Structure formats: C-alpha cells, structure tokens
Design a protein around this motif. Structure first.
Motif, PDB file in Angstrom:
ATOM      1  N   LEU A 131       3.424 -71.144  32.527  1.00 38.47           N
ATOM      2  CA  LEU A 131       4.034 -70.012  32.419  1.00 38.47           C
ATOM      3  C   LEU A 131       3.293 -68.769  32.617  1.00 38.47           C
ATOM      4  CD1 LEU A 131       7.077 -68.955  31.978  1.00 38.47           C
ATOM      5  CD2 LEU A 131       6.265 -68.680  29.484  1.00 38.47           C
ATOM      6  N   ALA A 132       2.123 -68.723  31.948  1.00 38.49           N
ATOM      7  CA  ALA A 132       1.164 -67.654  32.085  1.00 38.49           C
ATOM      8  C   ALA A 132       0.540 -67.457  33.611  1.00 38.49           C
ATOM      9  CB  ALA A 132      -0.193 -67.786  31.015  1.00 38.49           C
ATOM     10  N   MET A 133       0.529 -68.494  34.316  1.00 40.66           N
ATOM     11  CA  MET A 133       0.052 -68.561  35.918  1.00 40.66           C
ATOM     12  C   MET A 133       1.083 -68.049  36.641  1.00 40.66           C
ATOM     13  SD  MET A 133      -2.425 -69.130  37.989  1.00 40.66           S
ATOM     14  CE  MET A 133      -3.404 -70.348  37.633  1.00 40.66           C
ATOM     15  N   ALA A 134       2.394 -68.157  36.332  1.00 35.67           N
ATOM     16  CA  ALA A 134       3.437 -67.486  36.990  1.00 35.67           C
ATOM     17  C   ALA A 134       3.275 -65.982  36.724  1.00 35.67           C
ATOM     18  CB  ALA A 134       4.749 -67.855  36.516  1.00 35.67           C
ATOM     19  N   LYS A 135       3.169 -65.576  35.494  1.00 32.14           N
ATOM     20  CA  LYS A 135       3.060 -64.240  35.192  1.00 32.14           C
ATOM     21  C   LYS A 135       1.911 -63.353  35.912  1.00 32.14           C
ATOM     22  CE  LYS A 135       3.854 -60.995  31.272  1.00 32.14           C
ATOM     23  NZ  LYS A 135       3.797 -60.628  29.904  1.00 32.14           N
ATOM     24  N   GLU A 136       0.713 -64.030  35.986  1.00 36.01           N
ATOM     25  CA  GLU A 136      -0.350 -63.921  36.729  1.00 36.01           C
ATOM     26  C   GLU A 136      -0.279 -63.617  37.978  1.00 36.01           C
ATOM     27  OE1 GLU A 136      -3.056 -63.032  35.114  1.00 36.01           O
ATOM     28  OE2 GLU A 136      -4.858 -62.949  36.970  1.00 36.01           O
ATOM     29  N   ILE A 137       0.450 -64.332  38.598  1.00 36.15           N
ATOM     30  CA  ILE A 137       0.809 -64.116  40.199  1.00 36.15           C
ATOM     31  C   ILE A 137       1.988 -63.748  40.529  1.00 36.15           C
ATOM     32  CG2 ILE A 137      -0.391 -66.061  40.834  1.00 36.15           C
ATOM     33  CD1 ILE A 137       2.090 -67.838  41.318  1.00 36.15           C
ATOM     34  N   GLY A 138       2.693 -62.876  39.429  1.00 37.09           N
ATOM     35  CA  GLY A 138       4.142 -62.294  39.455  1.00 37.09           C
ATOM     36  C   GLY A 138       5.341 -63.214  40.298  1.00 37.09           C
ATOM     37  N   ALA A 139       5.266 -64.390  39.923  1.00 39.68           N
ATOM     38  CA  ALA A 139       6.252 -65.209  40.274  1.00 39.68           C
ATOM     39  C   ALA A 139       7.681 -64.990  39.215  1.00 39.68           C
ATOM     40  CB  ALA A 139       5.998 -66.981  39.774  1.00 39.68           C
ATOM     41  N   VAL A 140       8.636 -64.941  40.246  1.00 41.22           N
ATOM     42  CA  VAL A 140       9.800 -64.718  39.439  1.00 41.22           C
ATOM     43  C   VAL A 140      10.274 -65.639  38.548  1.00 41.22           C
ATOM     44  CG1 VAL A 140      10.692 -63.030  41.162  1.00 41.22           C
ATOM     45  CG2 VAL A 140      11.491 -65.111  41.076  1.00 41.22           C
ATOM     46  N   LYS A 141      10.014 -66.987  38.757  1.00 39.81           N
ATOM     47  CA  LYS A 141      10.233 -68.135  37.791  1.00 39.81           C
ATOM     48  C   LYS A 141       8.912 -69.266  37.893  1.00 39.81           C
ATOM     49  CE  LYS A 141      14.196 -69.326  35.508  1.00 39.81           C
ATOM     50  NZ  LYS A 141      14.922 -68.141  34.827  1.00 39.81           N
ATOM     51  N   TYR A 142       9.013 -69.908  36.732  1.00 42.29           N
ATOM     52  CA  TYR A 142       8.155 -71.038  36.584  1.00 42.29           C
ATOM     53  C   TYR A 142       9.154 -72.392  36.416  1.00 42.29           C
ATOM     54  CZ  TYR A 142       4.803 -74.402  35.017  1.00 42.29           C
ATOM     55  OH  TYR A 142       4.058 -75.609  34.856  1.00 42.29           O
ATOM     56  N   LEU A 143       8.916 -73.232  37.149  1.00 39.91           N
ATOM     57  CA  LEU A 143       9.585 -74.292  36.919  1.00 39.91           C
ATOM     58  C   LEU A 143       8.622 -75.717  36.947  1.00 39.91           C
ATOM     59  CD1 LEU A 143      12.809 -73.372  39.038  1.00 39.91           C
ATOM     60  CD2 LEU A 143      12.690 -73.909  36.492  1.00 39.91           C
ATOM     61  N   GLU A 144       9.232 -76.698  36.422  1.00 41.02           N
ATOM     62  CA  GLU A 144       8.204 -78.186  36.395  1.00 41.02           C
ATOM     63  C   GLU A 144       9.191 -79.219  36.921  1.00 41.02           C
ATOM     64  OE1 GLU A 144       6.671 -78.175  32.339  1.00 41.02           O
ATOM     65  OE2 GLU A 144       5.014 -77.180  33.055  1.00 41.02           O
ATOM     66  N   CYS A 145       8.821 -80.223  37.768  1.00 42.92           N
ATOM     67  CA  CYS A 145       9.914 -81.020  38.167  1.00 42.92           C
ATOM     68  C   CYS A 145       8.951 -82.466  38.547  1.00 42.92           C
ATOM     69  CB  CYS A 145      10.449 -80.667  39.374  1.00 42.92           C
ATOM     70  SG  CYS A 145       9.548 -80.459  40.743  1.00 42.92           S
TER      71      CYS A 145
END
Ligand code: GDP
Ligand code: MG
Length: 170
Positions: A131-145
């Motif tokens: 989630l922290a990496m998503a914030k760091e790259i400005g991703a709109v969402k973080y999902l795991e699958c």
C-alpha cells in the motif's frame, strides 16, 4: 449494445505472473501449458457498475490504464516497481492511472516459500508495504491476487475499469 472499449497495459518483471494473471482472468482457468509469444493480448467483455465494457489486455514481456505487477514473494520485483516500471510508464504517459498489483498471493502465507526466502535473508511483501509502494508511485489502487486460486483476480480488472470510467475530481 454498444460497449465502451478500454485498453489496459500490463507490465512488471519477468516471472511475476503477468501472463498467467491475464489467462486466468479471461479464460477462467490457470494455465498448466506453455503459452507462446503468439498471444501478446487478451480480451474480456465484462459488466462493471452496470456498464458493458470491452477490456483489452496487453501483455508486454494509448493505454487507458496500466497494471504494474510484482510478485508478493519476490522483493526484487517489488523494488523494480519504483526503480523501473513506474518511471517507464510515466515517461510515456504522465497522467494515465496505474493500478499496483501484488501477484502470487497464494504463496505469501506458504510455509516453504516463506522458508526459502528466509534462507536468502528475505520475506514476502506485506499488505501495508504494498500500500505504501502504491502511494510512493501514485497508483490509484493497490490490489493483491492469485492467478492460481483466482483470489482477488476479478477485483484487479474491475478496479482497472473503474479507474478509467471514474477519474478523480482532483
Ligand atoms: N503459485 C503461484 N504461481 C503463479 C501464479 N501466477 C503465475 N505463477 C507461476 O509463476 C511463473 C511465471 O508466470 P508467468 O505468468 O509466465 O510470468 P510472466 O513472466 O510475468 O508472464 C510460472 O511458473 C507460473 O506458473 C500464482 O498466482 N500463484
Ligand atoms: Mg509472460
């Protein structure tokens, strides 16, 4: 109908599960067979929020949305999210939404994958780290699958679609 076409481009390090992700989603079966360079894109017609959509999915080895993928059991693929994949996407496209996708979720609690990592001094990526990496790259969402079990798999694509049909106000 009348459907909206959406182009989604999938990137990430080799062996993180991009091809298996796309095949598992579009055919509903995790592949147990070799998949040639023949196929570099896949398609699915899906209903999202009452809207019919043709999702075009490009498997890389004018995107409307990017998936940047790293394996939850490869810290090296996770670092490359910021070191390689985020910059490469942003050079080409400053504004197009990115979804960050942690793959192979079925292994993050796997005892032997956890041990194997441990013997190189490594550990699976955790949800808060992702989630922290998503914030760091400005991703709109973080999902795991997992492509293998299909846990979290439909949500990845539903959210890629929502990212396009519902851009933020600012
Ligand atoms: N356990 C587990 N293995 C996976 C999953 N997805 C892919 N794999 C395996 O990871 C390896 C690489 O997958 P592939 O889709 O070819 O990765 P790519 O190079 O990113 O396209 C293969 O041996 C797959 O069987 C998953 O969700 N769970
Ligand atoms: Mg592949």
């Amino acid at each position: 109908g009348s459907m909206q076409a959406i182009k989604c481009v999938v990137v990430g390090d080799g062996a993180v599960g991009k091809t298996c992700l796309l095949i598992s989603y579009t055919t509903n079966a995790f592949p147990g067979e070799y998949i040639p360079t023949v196929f570099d894109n896949y398609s699915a017609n899906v209903m999202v929020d009452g809207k019919p959509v043709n999702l075009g999915l490009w498997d890389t080895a004018i995107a409307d949305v990017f998936l940047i993928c790293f394996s939850l059991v490869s810290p090296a693929s996770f670092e490359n999210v910021r070191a390689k994949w985020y910059p490469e996407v942003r050079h080409h496209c400053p504004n197009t939404p990115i979804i960050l996708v942690g793959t192979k979720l079925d292994l993050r609690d796997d005892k032997d994958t956890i041990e194997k990592l441990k013997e190189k001094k490594l550990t699976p990526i955790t949800y808060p780290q992702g989630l922290a990496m998503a914030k760091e790259i400005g991703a709109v969402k973080y999902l795991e699958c997992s492509a293998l079990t299909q846990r979290g798999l439909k949500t990845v694509f539903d959210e890629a679609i929502r990212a396009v049909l519902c851009p933020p106000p600012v």
